[PDB]
Amino acid sequence: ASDYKDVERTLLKLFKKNNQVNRVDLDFLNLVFTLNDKDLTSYHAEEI
Amino acid sequence: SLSLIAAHSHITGLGLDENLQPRPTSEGMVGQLQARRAAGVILKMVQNGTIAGRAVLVAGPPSTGKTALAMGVSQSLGKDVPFTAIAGSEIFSLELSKTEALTQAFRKSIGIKIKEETELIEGEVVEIQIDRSGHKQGKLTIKTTDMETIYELGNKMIDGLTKEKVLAGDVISIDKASGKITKLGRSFARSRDYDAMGADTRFVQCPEGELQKRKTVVHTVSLHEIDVINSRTQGFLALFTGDTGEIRSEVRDQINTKVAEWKEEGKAEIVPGVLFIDEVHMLDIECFSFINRALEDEFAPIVMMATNRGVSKTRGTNYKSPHGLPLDLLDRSIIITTKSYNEQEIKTILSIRAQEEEVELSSDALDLLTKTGVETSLRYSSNLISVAQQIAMKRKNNTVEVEDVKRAYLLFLDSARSVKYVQENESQYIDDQGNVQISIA
Amino acid sequence: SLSLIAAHSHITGLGLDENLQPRPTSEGMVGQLQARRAAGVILKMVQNGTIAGRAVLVAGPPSTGKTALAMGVSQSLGKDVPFTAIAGSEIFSLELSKTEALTQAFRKSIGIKIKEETELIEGEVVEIQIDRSIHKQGKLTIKTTDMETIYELGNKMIDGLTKEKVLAGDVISIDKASGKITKLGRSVQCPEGELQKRKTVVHTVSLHEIDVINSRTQGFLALFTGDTGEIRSEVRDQINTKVAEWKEEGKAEIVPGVLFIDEVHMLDIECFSFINRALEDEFAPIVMMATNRGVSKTRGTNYKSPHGLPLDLLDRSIIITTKSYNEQEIKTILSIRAQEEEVELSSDALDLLTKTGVETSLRYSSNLISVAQQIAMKRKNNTVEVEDVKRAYLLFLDSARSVKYVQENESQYIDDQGNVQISIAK
Amino acid sequence: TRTAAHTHIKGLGLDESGVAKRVEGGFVGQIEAREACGVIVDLIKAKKMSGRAILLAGGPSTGKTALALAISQELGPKVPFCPLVGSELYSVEVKKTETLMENFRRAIGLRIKETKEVYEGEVTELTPEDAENPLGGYGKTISHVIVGLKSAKGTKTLRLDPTIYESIQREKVSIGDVIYIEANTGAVKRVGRSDAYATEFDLETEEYVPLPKGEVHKKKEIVQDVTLHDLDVANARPQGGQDVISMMGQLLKPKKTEITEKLRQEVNKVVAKYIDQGVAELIPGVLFIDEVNMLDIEIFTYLNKALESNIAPVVVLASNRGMTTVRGTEDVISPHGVPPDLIDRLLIVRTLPYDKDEIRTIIERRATVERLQVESSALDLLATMGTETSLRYALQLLAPCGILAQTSNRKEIVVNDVNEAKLLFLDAKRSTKILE
């Protein structure tokens, strides 16, 4: 499987150029909220 | 609520009077007077909250208001009353057993209203002065919009302050029970100090009122949610993922004991709800045999069941059944029957549908649609309504007429005409044996 | 690819001329004139690449070279082009859905060639100075056939060469862009020109491989382990649109290939239903199907079917039919097989083997050749004589003789009802 | 370019008033079916109704998939269109009901726009400062950092938070490296080294990148189309976290799991909130289920329930069999293999078989799009063959005829080439006869 590492890097590099540019941060807009339960408090959230 | 124009978007609830008397037309429902009376009785039974474990069966032909009656009940119940709507085929899973799926569905229909009392101090820190040799000592001042106070800090409080790295102008909250320190955010006055801001920074106003405040909060959590949370160390993620597995029975018994303890101490309230199972005939005999006992638990919710099949063969058995359900389950079930609508009721339903879809029907088109409904089907006409609207719109005409309905009838077929064509052209369609004449000449 | 001798090793091609007219015996293939013609037409269609989603069925009696034909097509197609030959019993998996497996099978036969130009220095080696901070000062020298010159390193190059611990007087390859360092043995070999060369390396991958590469955090392990799992359809859609964009850009070319299902009679009706649609779409390869049974009940269905396949698929396929070999074709195929297996048969032995294969099966005589050769080896004889073939016939049985033996003594064997007469007496 | 079965179909070929031309958009005939498809396309473009269902009913090789792909082309790339086949619903990781729900939501697109401000350029200075008083902070007491970025249009000196400095330290950025700072989140990315310093060292492994174009601080409004299922996946399997537990979970295969109704409810709430603010808009698409005959009774029942949801695409179904027992049931003979209750919720669009002239025109178009020239006599022979056995047989037999003609170095296919192709490749009826 070591012989395929160069191909993997090439494909990842090819896909990253398009992937990074035209994407919207769903986490930034609070579309992802399953991590919020770990570091936030209910009454703290309502007060903030 | 996020919604689009749907089939039951026009049913605001059961059109019942104060004495549970149905109106000729109200809240988007027409007819089914006996069924609506029964639904209101069921609603009062649910609201009362004393009667436990009652099964209700709704039977009748398709397109006779079973799902409509259930939707009306759901709309009438409103929030704060659980309402779990599941299909017969939803219980079949590759991860959960059928009994486990039913158990999770049942607990989802019961909600627990738990009260939490919180004591907090919140305010903007004005000055912090720390002296350290021996143990350290220091004084701290916190102000609000209408208060200011100087406090003396213990060693553990100072340690928490240091480990949180709090600075002046920050609004922080301290729980005097545990001493935990949370940084709410920064003041607006410090916003100018930088060009780019980190993810952690937050700008909030200074809290008002007294520095020390007491607040109690009520939380609504279902029994299934409590079991999942209390099973593993990260069950709250499974509450969304659904990969919860078959919770240990000892866990469920302990959770029942805990809920009883809270209710005895008066800090938790039970809000029983309604479980609606669509197409109950898709269940198996094992599921029904489990339901027979499961309906009889003290925490069982009130289960409504809707079926359209008549005397058919029960799944998992080799015999036919009155409704596809075992007699033991029907023994503990009261059956509500529905009757097909007449011409006037179909006319009223079509008028209601036209109003809901903001389509301007004409009287002659309405009569034609009612005639087509009584001849072929009500749902067929309901589906034809929008097609007629689009056909009229294409003709740069803002109103629907008879020609548009005729064109819709010609373009889109119904069940009867489709059967006529398939019987007339049996040679060009594949049959049960798989033979088909693809050639034409 | 070193391997022992198989039953199809002799097939080195499909044996076509310029005019696609097959010769009587070339590249291992005997006869089967129309079958080879059709196989060559399919091969040219694949090489052209302008036609997608065509299914070809190979038809006629079992043991009539349908797999031999498909192998001839694969070999004549050559390398640098995908050709996936999977049995229908490999589709049914407990970890991959049948539809997902069929989708992966279709995508595996569509190749994409992407060119990557890398700057790599290839040189014979000369002494290297690495020094501490005065972040780090270092120099290396490289010798080639016509230059010997010093490079001054930076932080990361120094770190990489320290990690590699490259010696002197040996041979080293360093890539300017990637930064990978490849060691080589001592100078048998020597640098052949400029110190820094500009050579492009071409990478052959399939759509499935790209899908798996982008599938996970370290998904490229799944290409070998096989625990890919059901990939999300949005991932495949993304791969499709990016491949279309790359092809438009001209930075990658597509090499359509051939998918071969050797035992189509094992897929169920659901697999056929998916296959019907999979052929229609673009990027669909050409599927070769082989079946031996005339009319049977399709798996997953309770009714017979004209080839074991539903008529919907039969409408979408073109069928290539194979005639059974004649005595002369049998003789020359046995001659080729004996020559491949390094067996020196006699003329009368060859005639007897021909008649034996004609009477029972070509495969039976083909397997009897090696048995006869080993029998002769016990007699310390080089040439295989008639008595060796007769002893091979007597010691090892064909299907019909074994059937006769079982039929005449069905009491001592276990029957369908589970009865047997173990007792030798009574 | 590759020529698929439905490549020649370029559009529905309708007029502004809805009338369909006899030959347009690659279509031949099927006037009534094309008009019905035009009405359905208008309904989809209206974007008002949810849960409407229609069924494309007809025999094999009539154009059900052709009509579906024509609808997809006519709708445009801004309207969701999820193709499917009935067999794919039978998963081994989760129940078929869950897979139907997942695919069903995929066809509800959402277009959300977000304006983002980014600081990018080449670092020229980096001078960390401590607080004016040692008592001001804790430990290192590191105050703001000053960074100098260079772009094609000038330079700017920025004042950054200590958190941004920590991000800089994490990304290992030195003077001359091209960087990229997002003020939205405080995330720092290291693009690489400037091409100006490409030749600083004659052997070094560094990804040299050009100086960023435009201003150092460019504000752009980003618009993306995301499905509801995308949000569901993001919540179910978030990619955040840098812990060892996070990495171990990342290495795991992304097996499908039964996403609970609660997560969809929360997603619907948040999407409603953002649409209410006007930032985002909902685009109900179309879900295509080919070979609806192969679905199990449970899948049909769940389709019955799915259509009663508040958010639901227009499912279009294809069936090529009549009066066929439903899979998973012993006795229920149904019109198109679809249970009678589901048929009552459907609108059947009947498609009619073709005559010789339509077959002739289709063969003409297919040969044209195939870059193949066909003689009139050979084309009549092909049309007779197709009307004798099947149209699809001729439509596929065009290619071997072209290959044979090329092998004879002829520009157009001759009748002899068609005869030789007939000899080489048989059909279903001829194969059945020869096997008898």
Place this chain on the structure above:
Amino acid sequence: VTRTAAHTHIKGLGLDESGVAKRVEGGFVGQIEAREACGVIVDLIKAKKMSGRAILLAGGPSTGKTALALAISQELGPKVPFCPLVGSELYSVEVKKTETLMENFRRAIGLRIKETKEVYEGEVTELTPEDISHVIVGLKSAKGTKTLRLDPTIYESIQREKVSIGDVIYIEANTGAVKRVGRSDAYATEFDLETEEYVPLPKGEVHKKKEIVQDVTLHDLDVANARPQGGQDVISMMGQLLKPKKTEITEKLRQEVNKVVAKYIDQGVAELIPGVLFIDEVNMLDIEIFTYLNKALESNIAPVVVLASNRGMTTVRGTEDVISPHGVPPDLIDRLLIVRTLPYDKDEIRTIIERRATVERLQVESSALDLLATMGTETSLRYALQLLAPCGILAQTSNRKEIVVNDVNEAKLLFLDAKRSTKILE
């Protein structure tokens, strides 16, 4: 002293140099023709030329199919791989039947390689870290002393092995494994009461190098290249406790392993030892297994698989209307050579009983042995075979060594046969 099983007396085929089989050699009686065929097959296997060859041992119950298989395994020797199976084993639950079958296929192909082992062994004298940083450790041996620089993984191993200075350690360079062999003898009197185990200072030089030969199979290489299998690092622990179940190894991994093995053979560091795969109760195999086994037999790298079956005109499992000679579909039957095995007469049964008694160290009177032989002829040979141990137990209970007629009659009266039990049920 020793244990006895069904085939403890089977030592070989007993065939001469010319290949003809004596009536009684190697513990076998009769069945000369089958023994000669098996010897020819043994020669075919030993040639190491053909691949995928398959034969069928067709006969009734208690006729000598498993005996022939075990005799072939013994005669070939422990060098070659002989893998017996029942078809029931293929029906795994973790991976599909194809994966198990292919794994068994490549497990039956052997590889013998030469490897050099670098060994260091020392008592420890210094422990310095190069600052997760490299560690510097000093070591001495009876001939001298050495100081070594070890990678951070070895540092973690040493830290997690509770090595002290003055401990004796073993480092295998190939695997990077650190083992604490104990405490040096020089510190035996360091305390009076501790849990230390004292070992003497290793003899010779610190660094040793030896050349071993180790036998591996293709499946072992596949598993090695698929999942982590050893190591003393926590990284290895996490890597191997992740994805614990078996996975469907892809064709690509097998192709790469084949290429590696070909490279090793070409370099001369490896040699190939093709072996045998034995499947018993072949009737248990479903139609899918036979269908894929059709594909594997055509594979260019396959062992000499032998098949045993004992059912006649029985329907094929899975199928409902396929009547086949032995439950084997005609597609696979043409790939097989059928070796017929015949029942036993009275004299051979008597001789077999005599030899079994001699092997299990029993003494049987001539009249008692005649009675046992005639009752085995009446009912079944295996019935007589399993009655021998109870007869010997009975004789001991009578304080008598040799078996007499009374013990045999008592054993018959105590334990019954299947036919007698069936009569009792009726």
